[PDB]
Amino acid sequence: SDQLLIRPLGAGQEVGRSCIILEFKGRKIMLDCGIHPGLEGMDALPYIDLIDPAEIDLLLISHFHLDHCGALPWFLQKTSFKGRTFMTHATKAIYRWLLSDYVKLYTETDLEESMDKIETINFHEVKEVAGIKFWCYHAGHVLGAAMFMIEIAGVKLLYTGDFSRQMAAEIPNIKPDILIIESTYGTHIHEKREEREARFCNTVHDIVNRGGRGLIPVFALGRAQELLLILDEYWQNHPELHDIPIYYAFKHISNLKSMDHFDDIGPSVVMASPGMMQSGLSRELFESWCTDKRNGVIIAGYCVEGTLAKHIMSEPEEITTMSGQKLPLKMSVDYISFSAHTDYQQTSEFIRALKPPHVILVHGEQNEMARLKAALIREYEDNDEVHIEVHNPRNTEAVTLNFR
Template sequence: MAIDSLVLGAGQEVGKSCVVVTINGKRIMFDCGMHMGHLDHQRYPDFSLFLNLNPTRTSITPSLASSSPTCTKRKQKPTLIFHLDHVGALPYFTEVCGYRGPIYMTYPTKALAPIMLEDYRKVMVERRGEEEQFSSDHIAECMKKVIPVDLKQTVQVDKDLQIRAYYAGHVLGAAMFYAKVGDAAMVYTGDYNMTPDRHLGAAQIERLNLDLLISESTYGTTIRDSKYAREREFLRAVHKCVAGGGKVLIPTFALGRAQELCILLEDYWERMNLEVPIYFSAGLTLQANMYYKMLISWTSQKVKETYSTRNAFDFKNAHKFDRSMIDAPGPCVLFATPGMISGGFSLEVFKHWAPSEMNLVTLPGYCVAGTIGHKLMSGKPTKIDLDKDTQIDVRCQIHHLSFSPHTDAKGIMDLIKFLSPKNVILVHGEKPKMATLKEKYSPNWEFNVMTLQTMRLSQFLQPTM
């Protein structure tokens, strides 16, 4: 019996996560993401690569002569989180490429994924004028195919294959998925966090007898400082800016860091008796906050314990931000999407606020190559070329402090040691960092550690009987 792995995305990069695993003839696709740093054919995984698989073991047969490949057999597809680099290509895969098999998500992911997908579609088509890759109807039809699952619920997909979801922390609804066919078993982590934060708990999984673990490695060479030290530095930078009359732009995705940092700011604002307004851009994050209130059982222990007296997501100092307020005088703090300043409202605000030395842009999370956020993190540019006709003067303060919900190198090592699989594949990380993690630690591990290049390599594993 064998486990075959084909990485269609996020092999040695961060973006468009998509891994196809075949366990004793049963094919599973984990994630179906898009790359936030590309606007061309590299945006989505190359689904035509299924043609390179053994046809007797392949469940999808796309036609290169057609723009609408068809699915000839069913293939199970768990989607682990709602972030676009994990779910962004899903409507394209189902409604354009014609996939007709089952799709599994946790209940929060099923609730939140269509919100993120529709927001992305609006930004790219209605505001940027790009050709539509999928429509609102495509999103709706895609979500009808989704089968929601509970944590630790064993789902018997067919007589041979069973899957089970485990709490991953990271963002609301994130899950690690366990899959087993016969005696062969594996876990795909997706994004996870081994450390609890203010609004979510740490990843939780039981000891399992695994032939393969596929783990993210975004921060594979980073050991983070104390969370409290990072929080103090963040609050100090924000307070200094608004005290001087400046505006603070915090580019975040609508769910996750926005709620984490707003809880932090709310507490600080009350302790310091500050009256500077805090804003969320448009309705996306406000809508997300509603789901956080509905899905309290997925949050941290502290949030659940205090829920009867105070809902942590009822933000007293946070308000909706309108476009007409961009050039309004006076200090403020604004959470704007998307988190990497790859487009959308955060980019619109950045154009207005970046030229002023009084203002601050603080980047709380990871930014993929090709985005403005990545350029700001990689140095201190004085100008950024948005396109051949648009140049942005950058005189504002730039502050990067990781509040990323991804686990760090210690967390990755702790999970691998705890699960002790026979084989490990590292994905969702930058190639040099993945190589460093593998070289530094794998000699001390009693199992095989691999990194697979996107689209070019597949690995065949023989589980021990």
């Protein structure tokens, strides 16, 4: 029998800095290498100290979001890592653009110097490195997102990275022995898409109707363009809103460039990034509008601990200006999901289709992940013909499996 070891260095019982180590029959693989959106500098990095970069044969990146590849430039240009790295074409493209803008660990120089060290891979195409065969499936979630299936000595493991089944994620016909899957939404169930878009539109409407400024923080394109389509349509069907502008930083939406390139007048809707409001325009606008109860913000994506958007949802009496000033939070705050992750029914169905004897949960808040684990254990705790062990390792903790 051969022993297989899986160990999160990031995203273990948390969302952020996804980086999971896999060790089997002499090979070592790293799955993702991102940073924690809610942490600063070196503290926002996975615990790559526990390992020797030089011993990593393969590095696979699921998608372009920062919590999955935010720390790559650093890893590639500042450690003893001399292995091979792979991404899908689109992922790599958006990588340079996205990580660059992130540069407001490494520098613009390092990023451009890592591009050469990153190989691309097409979907449904088998690649081989050090006796490790791998290929990817569409993950849904975002453009270019991939779920890597890995095979070593006949043992197969599927890593979902981040995925959605609502472009929908493919369900592999090839059954893996091990499944590493995201736990973002835990046991939550997503509300009907139509009810979601209606509540989103009615909330935006309420804000501008009372003379308010409505802020909609969004990232690169995790749903940005989709929301613009929803609002524009709604505006078309409501002539009484034609004089209320909608800016994006279509027939009713105009593009904005900066807080210095737009007039902040009467009621309006402004969709700006970053989605989690740590800095940038979304944060500046929030700081300029938070004291007026007529205004409102609508968080349309999942927000990691440590971020302003997440804190705002706790409905604090006051907020902290980037400059350190204290401002009262009077604008309304609403949360309507559009982050594109699977909910419990979708995760459950995915796992039921593949029936992996071993399921390893990552990328989920501790408590959310614990309920998912329990609910999954409960699902197969009844039938004795399907044995599935669910693991929820903390960062640094290893899961050990023996094969053959």
